[PDB]
Write a protein that binds this ligand. Structure first.
Ligand code: CL
Ligand code: CL
Ligand code: CL
Ligand code: CL
Ligand code: K
Ligand code: MG
Ligand code: MG
Ligand code: MG
Ligand code: MG
Ligand code: MG
Ligand code: MG
Ligand code: MG
Ligand code: MG
Ligand code: MG
Ligand code: MG
Ligand code: MG
Ligand code: MG
Ligand code: MG
Ligand code: MG
Ligand code: MG
Ligand code: MG
Ligand code: MG
Ligand code: NA
Ligand code: NA
Ligand code: NA
Ligand code: NA
Ligand code: NA
Ligand code: NA
Ligand code: NA
Ligand code: NA
Ligand code: NA
Ligand code: NA
Ligand code: NA
Lengths: 56, 92, 237, 194
RNA sequence: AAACAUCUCAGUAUCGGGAGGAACAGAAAACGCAAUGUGAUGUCGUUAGUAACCGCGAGUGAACGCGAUACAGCCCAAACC
RNA sequence: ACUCGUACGGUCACUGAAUCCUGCCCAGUGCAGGUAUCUGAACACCUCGUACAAGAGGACGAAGGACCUGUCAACGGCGGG
RNA sequence: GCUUUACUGCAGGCUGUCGCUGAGGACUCUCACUCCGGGAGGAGGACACCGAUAGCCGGGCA
C-alpha cells in the first residue's frame, strides 16, 4: 500500500480541537493538551524565545 | 670516534690555553616547579588537554655531541657546538 | 550506532512487559501469628498463566480464600496445614527445622516469612540435607548447596506439572502462544543477521561475528552480548 | 561575662566532639526519617539564629532542609560535543547546597521570604541546614523596626534572585577590592564570568 | 584557528526560576599613583588593546588612578539590663 | 522492566526440522581461573628538602599486566618442503 | 552513516583510598547504616549503600 494518497483515507480521527483557553484549534483531545498555549500541561502560557529572531 | 679525555685548548674564562677534561653532559633532575609545570596542572582538565595531550617525538638516526669542557686550573666548564657522531668513546 | 535490543528491554515498554493484568495470584506462604492451628481445604485446581502449571484454590478456617503453589499429589477435598506443628505430608508448609531430612521440598523461603522464593517451577524441588540449630543445608534444583535459616518455611513435595519440557513445541505457533503470556519479546533475530549499526555482531558480507563471542564482565551495556564472561565454551575438553 | 549563647557557639565549632557529637548521632537518626523540608518550633543553634536576625516572635519561622551531598546530577550529552564538553562525573553546580536548601524551603512556604540560613551538620550522603523565613504580611513583623524591611515589595522572592546572604557570598560579592571585577554589581552585567 | 583536539564562536543561542518601574550594587577584614596618600555603590569618559592569558598559534583581555554624573548614610548579634 | 516470575527459570548469543554425523589445533586474539617472583595509582607512613609549602626519594602494594592453566557447538586455522 | 589493536576523550564495570564509621596482618562485637518480618522481632553490620578520589578495562558513546 502506498504511503501517499492510499494512506490518506483512514484519516477520520479527531485530535487537535478548539482550545478552551487560547481559542486555537490545537487542543489535542486525546492528550488533553494544547500544542499552542500549553493549556493542560502548564499553568503558564506556552512561549519560547525561538518564536522570533534572536535579536528581536 | 675516539676522543681524548684531556687535552690543551683555549679556556674562555681564564683567557689562556690550558688542559681541559671532556665529560658527557649528564642530565640534571627536574624540580617540577617551573612555570611550565604549573601550567600543566592548571590548564589540564575535562577532555583533551591541548599541548599537554601530546606525546614524545621521534629520533634522529645520529645525535650530536653533548660535551662539557672542564678547565684544569680554574675548574670552570664551558660548552661548544657539538657534531653528529654515531658513538663517542674517551681515551684514558 | 543505535541501542541494541537488550537496552530497549530495560525501558519496560509494553512489548517487553508481562501481561500482569492477566496473572492470577502472587503465590506466597501465609502469615500465621504462631501456634500453627491454621489449616484449610483444597477447593479447586487452577492453571497459573504465569507459570504454565497448576495452582490450588484453598479455603482456610478463618474465612481466607487464597490460591497456592500446588505440589504434585493434591486434589479437591484434601486438607492442607501450615505452621510449626503442621503434619509432615505433601501440600503442607513448615520450617525446614520441623522437616525430616531426605524429604523433597518446594517453594522454599530465602529469608523466613518472605513467602517462598526457591524451587517453584514445574516439576522441580529442593532437597533438605543437613540439620542444625543455625543452618539447614538445602540442595536447590540447580545442584547448589544453599545454607539456610532453619526458620525458613517450605512446602513438602515436588512442584506440580512435572515433565513439561519433555514434549517439543513442534511448531512456531505453540511457542507464539506461550511467549504471549510472559515478559519476553519473541521471535528472536540473530545479532549476526543485523546491520553493524544495530548489534556488535552486525554487518559483513556474510554472517559471522566480528570479534570473538566471549565478552568481559566489565563490558558496558550496548556491548555485553554473545557469551557473557564464559569460563569456557564448546563441549570438548 | 560569657553569654549562655556563647556556649552553643563554642559547642558547634566542633560538631564531632563532646556532647554535640552524641547529640548529632542521635538527632540525625530522626532527621533521616523526616521529610525534605521540616518546620521546627525552635532553632537548633540559637546563637546562630539570633545572630542571623532571628527573634522568638510572631511571623518568624525556621525549617530544616536536607539536600544530597556531592557534584552535579548531570545527564550525559545526547548529541555532538567537543571533548571539553563531554564531561559528566566531574561537573559541579555553581550554587552551593546551602543555597539549594534555602530555595527548597522558600518554595515550601510561598508566602514567606528567606531571611537567612545556617548549617546543622551532615552524614555520609546529605547535609542539613535550618532556614529562617519571615511572614512579611504579619503585623508583628510589619511593625518590627529590625525586620520590617523584608516587607517591601522589592524583597519578593529574594532567595530566587540571590539576594540572600549565602546568595551574595556565592555570587563572589564578599571582597570589595581585587578579585571582584567580574562579580559586582552583578554576574549578569559582567557577562557571566565567575 | 585557512585541517583540528586546548583555544575560539561564548557564558553567545536556547532552556529553568523570579523582582521592579527600574533592577542589581553599596558604607571597606577597600585601595596600595607606597603615601605626611584616597575614602560606600553604580554609571559615562579615559587609563588600554596597557598588565595578564594563549598548540605563547589564532586569538583573548582587566584593574588601581584620573576627569565627570549623582551623592548618604545607617540597623542588628553580644557585653550590661 | 524482567517479575502476580525463581534454574522444568530467564537472560545473552550461535546454529536452524527429522535422519547419519560433527575430525585435528589453545601458537596469536577473546573470555575465565591461578600465580613464587616481576610490574602496578592515589591516601596514609618513613627520608631529604622548606622555621611551613611546593618538590625529590623510599617502604607497602589492589584490580590489571608479565608468567601458568582451562576453553574452539570462542574469533579463527587445517600449508611448504 | 559505519568500523577498528587510528588520534583524543566520555560513560560504564572492576579495584585501592577518604567520608558516613562505632566498641573490643588476623579476629570479636553492636549502636549507626541495609534488608526480612504486621509486629515482637530476625538477618546483615562498620562492611554494604551513598558521596569523593586514584589505577585498570573501556568504539557502549562523542
Ligand atoms: Cl656525547
Ligand atoms: Cl520458552
Ligand atoms: Cl525568598
Ligand atoms: Cl589613591
Ligand atoms: K569547536
Ligand atoms: Mg513516510
Ligand atoms: Mg584532560
Ligand atoms: Mg512474587
Ligand atoms: Mg529448548
Ligand atoms: Mg508480550
Ligand atoms: Mg533466530
Ligand atoms: Mg541485511
Ligand atoms: Mg558497533
Ligand atoms: Mg550461516
Ligand atoms: Mg555463521
Ligand atoms: Mg547594572
Ligand atoms: Mg577551522
Ligand atoms: Mg595554526
Ligand atoms: Mg573570553
Ligand atoms: Mg586594583
Ligand atoms: Mg524493601
Ligand atoms: Mg566514531
Ligand atoms: Na585557574
Ligand atoms: Na557481521
Ligand atoms: Na517564598
Ligand atoms: Na571566573
Ligand atoms: Na579553515
Ligand atoms: Na574539516
Ligand atoms: Na590555549
Ligand atoms: Na595622580
Ligand atoms: Na590458540
Ligand atoms: Na588461548
Ligand atoms: Na551517510
Amino acid at each position: 500500500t502506498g504511503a501517499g494518497t492510499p494512506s490518506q483515507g483512514k484519516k477520520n480521527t479527531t485530535t487537535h480541537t478548539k482550545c478552551r483557553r487560547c481559542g486555537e484549534k490545537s487542543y489535542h483531545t486525546k492528550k488533553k493538551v494544547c500544542s499552542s498555549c500549553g493549556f493542560g500541561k502548564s499553568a503558564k502560557r506556552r512561549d519560547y524565545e525561538w518564536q522570533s529572531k534572536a535579536g528581536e | 670516534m675516539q676522543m681524548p679525555r684531556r687535552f690543551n685548548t683555549y679556556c674562555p674564562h681564564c683567557n689562556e690555553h690550558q688542559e681541559h677534561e671532556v665529560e658527557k653532559v649528564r642530565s640534571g633532575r627536574q624540580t617540577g616547579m617551573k612555570w611550565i609545570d604549573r601550567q600543566r596542572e592548571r590548564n589540564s582538565g575535562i577532555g583533551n588537554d591541548g599541548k599537554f595531550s601530546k606525546v614524545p617525538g621521534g629520533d634522529k638516526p645520529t645525535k650530536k655531541t653533548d660535551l662539557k669542557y672542564r678547565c684544569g686550573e680554574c675548574g670552570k666548564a664551558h660548552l661548544r657546538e657539538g657534531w653528529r657522531a654515531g658513538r663517542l668513546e674517551f681515551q684514558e | 550506532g543505535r541501542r541494541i535490543q537488550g537496552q530497549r528491554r530495560g525501558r519496560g515498554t509494553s512489548t517487553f512487559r508481562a501481561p500482569s493484568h492477566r496473572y492470577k495470584a502472587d503465590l506466597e506462604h501465609r502469615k500465621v501469628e504462631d501456634g500453627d492451628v491454621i489449616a484449610g481445604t483444597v477447593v479447586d485446581i487452577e492453571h497459573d498463566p504465569a507459570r504454565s502449571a497448576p495452582v490450588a484454590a484453598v479455603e482456610f478456617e478463618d474465612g481466607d480464600r487464597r490460591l497456592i503453589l500446588a505440589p504434585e499429589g493434591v486434589g479437591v477435598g484434601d486438607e492442607l496445614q501450615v505452621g510449626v506443628s503442621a503434619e509432615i505430608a505433601p501440600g503442607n508448609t513448615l520450617p525446614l527445622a520441623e522437616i525430616p531430612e531426605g524429604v523433597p521440598v518446594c517453594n522454599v523461603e530465602s529469608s523466613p516469612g518472605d513467602g517462598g522464593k526457591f524451587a517453584r517451577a514445574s516439576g522441580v524441588n529442593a532437597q533438605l540435607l543437613t540439620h542444625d540449630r543455625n543452618v539447614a543445608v538445602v540442595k536447590l534444583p540447580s545442584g547448589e548447596m544453599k545454607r539456610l535459616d532453619p526458620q525458613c518455611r517450605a512446602t513438602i513435595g515436588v512442584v506440580a506439572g512435572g515433565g513439561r519440557t519433555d514434549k517439543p513445541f513442534v511448531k512456531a505457533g505453540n511457542k507464539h502462544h506461550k511467549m504471549k503470556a510472559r515478559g519476553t519479546k519473541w521471535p528472536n533475530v540473530r545479532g549476526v543477521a543485523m546491520n553493524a549499526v544495530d548489534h556488535p555482531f552486525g554487518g559483513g558480507g556474510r554472517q559471522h561475528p566480528g570479534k570473538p563471542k566471549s565478552i568481559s564482565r566489565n563490558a558496558p551495556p550496548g556491548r555485553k552480548v554473545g557469551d557473557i564472561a564464559s569460563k569456557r565454551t564448546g563441549r570438548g575438553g | 561575662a560569657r553569654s549562655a549563647y556563647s556556649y552553643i557557639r563554642d559547642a558547634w565549632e566542633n560538631p564531632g566532639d563532646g556532647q554535640l557529637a552524641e547529640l548529632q548521632w542521635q538527632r540525625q537518626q530522626e532527621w533521616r526519617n523526616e521529610g525534605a523540608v521540616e518546620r521546627i518550633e525552635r532553632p537548633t543553634r540559637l546563637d546562630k539564629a539570633r545572630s542571623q536576625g532571628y527573634k522568638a516572635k510572631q511571623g518568624v519561622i525556621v525549617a530544616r532542609v536536607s539536600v544530597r551531598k556531592g557534584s552535579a546530577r548531570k545527564r550525559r550529552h545526547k548529541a555532538g560535543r567537543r571533548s571539553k564538553r563531554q564531561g559528566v562525573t566531574r561537573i559541579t553546580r555553581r550554587k552551593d547546597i546551602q543555597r539549594v536548601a534555602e530555595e527548597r524551603a522558600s518554595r515550601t512556604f510561598p508566602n514567606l521570604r528567606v531571611l537567612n540560613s545556617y548549617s546543622v551538620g551532615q552524614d555520609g550522603r546529605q547535609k542539613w541546614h535550618e532556614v529562617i523565613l519571615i511572614d512579611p504580611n504579619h503585623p508583628a513583623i510589619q511593625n518590627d523596626d529590625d525586620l520590617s524591611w523584608i516587607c517591601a515589595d522589592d524583597q519578593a522572592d529574594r532567595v530566587f534572585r540571590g539576594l540572600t546572604g549565602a546568595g551574595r557570598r556565592n555570587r563572589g560579592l564578599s571582597g570589595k577590592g581585587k578579585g571582584s571585577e567580574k562579580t559586582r554589581p552583578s554576574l549578569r552585567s559582567n557577562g557571566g564570568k565567575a
